[PDB]
Amino acid sequence: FEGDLKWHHHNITYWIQNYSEDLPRAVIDDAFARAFALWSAVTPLTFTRVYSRDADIVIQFGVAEHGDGYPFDGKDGLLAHAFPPGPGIQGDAHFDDDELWSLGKGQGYSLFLVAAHQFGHALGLDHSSVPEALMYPMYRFTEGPPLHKDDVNGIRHLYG
Amino acid sequence: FEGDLKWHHHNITYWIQNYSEDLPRAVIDDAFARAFALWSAVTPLTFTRVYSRDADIVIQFGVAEHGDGYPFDGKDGLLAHAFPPGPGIQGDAHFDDDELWSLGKGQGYSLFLVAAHQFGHALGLDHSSVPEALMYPMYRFTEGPPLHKDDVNGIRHLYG
Ligand SMILES: CC(C)[C@H](C(=O)O)N(CCNC(=O)c1cccc(C(=O)NCCN([C@@H](C(=O)O)C(C)C)S(=O)(=O)c2ccc(-c3ccccc3)cc2)c1)S(=O)(=O)c1ccc(-c2ccccc2)cc1
Ligand SMILES: [Ca+2]
Ligand SMILES: [Ca+2]
Ligand SMILES: [Ca+2]
Ligand SMILES: [Ca+2]
Ligand SMILES: [Ca+2]
Ligand SMILES: [Ca+2]
Ligand SMILES: [Zn+2]
Ligand SMILES: [Zn+2]
Ligand SMILES: [Zn+2]
Ligand SMILES: [Zn+2]
Numbered sequence: 001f002e003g004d005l006k007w008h009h010h011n012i013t014y015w016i017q018n019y020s021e022d023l024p025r026a027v028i029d030d031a032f033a034r035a036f037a038l039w040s041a042v043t044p045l046t047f048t049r050v051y052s053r054d055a056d057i058v059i060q061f062g063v064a065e066h067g068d069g070y071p072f073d074g075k076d077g078l079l080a081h082a083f084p085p086g087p088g089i090q091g092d093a094h095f096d097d098d099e100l101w102s103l104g105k106g107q108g109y110s111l112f113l114v115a116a117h118q119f120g121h122a123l124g125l126d127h128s129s130v131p132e133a134l135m136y137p138m139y140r141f142t143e144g145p146p147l148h149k150d151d152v153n154g155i156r157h158l159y160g
Numbered sequence: 161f162e163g164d165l166k167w168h169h170h171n172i173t174y175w176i177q178n179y180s181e182d183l184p185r186a187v188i189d190d191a192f193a194r195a196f197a198l199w200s201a202v203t204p205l206t207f208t209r210v211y212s213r214d215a216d217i218v219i220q221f222g223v224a225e226h227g228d229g230y231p232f233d234g235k236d237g238l239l240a241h242a243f244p245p246g247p248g249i250q251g252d253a254h255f256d257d258d259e260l261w262s263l264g265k266g267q268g269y270s271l272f273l274v275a276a277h278q279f280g281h282a283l284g285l286d287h288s289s290v291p292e293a294l295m296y297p298m299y300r301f302t303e304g305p306p307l308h309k310d311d312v313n314g315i316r317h318l319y320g
Contacts, residue, residue: 077298137297138237 005084006124006158007056007091013048015055018062020111022101028111031103032059035115039123042152043159056085057122061097072096079139080114082121093118109139116146125154165244166284166318167216167251173208175215180271182261188271191263192219195275199283202312203319216245217282221257232256239299240274242281253278265301274299276306285314 016032019025029049036047047057065071068089072078075098082093093115095101100108113134120135128135130150176192179185189209196207207217225231228249232238235258242253255261255274262268273294280295288295293310 077300140233140237 001126003084004124004158005086005090007045007085010044011046011048012057013050013052013055014057014059015050015052017058017060020061020095020097020101022097022108023103023111027103028101031111032115035112035119038116038147039119039155042147043123043155045123045159056091057119058092059095060092061095061101063097066094068092068094072098074098079109080118082118084121085124091122093122105141105143110141113141113146114139120151120155123155124158125151128154161244161284161286164284164318165246165250167205167245170204170206171208172205172217173210173212173215174217174219175210175212177213177218177220180221180255180257180261182268183263183271187263188261191271192275194272195279198276198306199279199315202307202315203283205283205319216251217279218252219255220252221255221261223257226254228252228254232258234258235260239269240278242278244281245284251282253282265303269299270301273301273306280311280315283315284318285311288314 014036016029019028023031033049039045040047060066063072064074070081078096079099080093080095083090085091095111095114095118101111102108103110103112117134125135127137128150130136130148133148133150134146135151135154174192174196176189179188183191193209199205200207223232224234230241238256239259240253240255243250245251253275255271260268261271263270263272277294285295287297288310290296290308290310291298293308294306295311295314
């Protein structure tokens with residue numbers, strides 16, 4: 001509630017600028033697609049993968065300094081970040097490639113879960129006080145449906 | 161916090177209820193004393209160690225669910241928590257003993273710097289937006305003085 005920053009059109013586009021070596025390109029594309037699908041279902045927004053610098057949400061993996069002014073910190077600590085909606089850097093989502101990206105139970109962080117969390121930020125969502133919620137600021141691996149009442153109440157407040 | 165929760169007396173008392181086995185008791189006593197020393201310089205408050213359950217700030221090391229419905233999660237993730245000022249549970253500071261507590265550069269998390277962050281919450285400070293600030297909610301080890309302008313502006317907003 002320093003805003004509320006939101007997108008001002010429904011058909012949001014995204015560009016996967018570059019890839020991590022941790023997973024196959026196809027797997028990465030799918031993790032990101034699944035992560036948008038979670039928000040797609042609960043909002044009037046649609047997400048279209050495009051191959052253009054002019055996409056609303058540009059996705060990159062970057063280690064340390066990746067030229068937006070906000071260095072990653074090597075392994076652990078900061079996992080990723082996303083800028084709230086608006087023009088340019090705003091809306092973009094950056095994943096620290098000093099982390100080990102994976103999917104499923106085990107090593108590293110689920111690219112899916114972390115992307116779903118970053119994309120909530122890329123839609124204008126802040127952190128939730130609810131510990132189970134996707135937008136709670138602490139990563140916990142879960143096999144369960146990632147969205148909870150508080151996440152859905154949050155986007156509904158913005159787009160609903 | 162909610163309505164700027166703050167203490168309404170100047171002589172704040174604390175009780176170290178139990179001890180982690182990670183460090184000598186004497187080192188633990190001194191780590192916590194130093195953490196209070198940092199907030200006493202910039203505030204009207206003084207902190208007196210007492211040996212009573214009626215202390216304002218009760219300090220304890222615990223694991224998982226530990227009595228307050230706000231459970232810890234084993235090694236890593238959540239490090240500690242403290243409650244804003246007020247009666248009973250309010251003001252108290254809990255340290256996850258599934259973490260390794262240490263001092264200096266190396267293993268584990270510095271009890272001194274974590275205590276200092278927790279005690280700022282136990283005085284009524286919320287999280288800071290400024291990544292260097294002691295009240296920034298990401299642990300980074302540092303040898304430099306812990307307080308930054310944002311922390312001290314925060315405490316002065318509460319206690320003048
Ligand atoms: C803003 C970004 C750069 C980014 C993000 O959230 O997008 N990240 C920043 C996150 N940090 C925060 O912005 C933040 C904001 C508000 C609150 C919090 C927070 O409350 N964390 C818990 C704080 N802890 C306690 C406390 O601070 O007293 C307490 C409230 C439980 S703590 O135990 O974790 C803790 C304690 C002490 C300290 C400490 C700090 C300084 C000195 C000494 C100690 C730090 C943390 C964290 S991140 O770390 O790379 C990240 C984290 C989680 C996810 C995620 C992925 C999938 C599913 C769910 C989550 C993705 C990315
Ligand atoms: Ca953008
Ligand atoms: Ca990192
Ligand atoms: Ca990686
Ligand atoms: Ca923990
Ligand atoms: Ca108390
Ligand atoms: Ca321990
Ligand atoms: Zn970035
Ligand atoms: Zn977040
Ligand atoms: Zn507790
Ligand atoms: Zn904190």
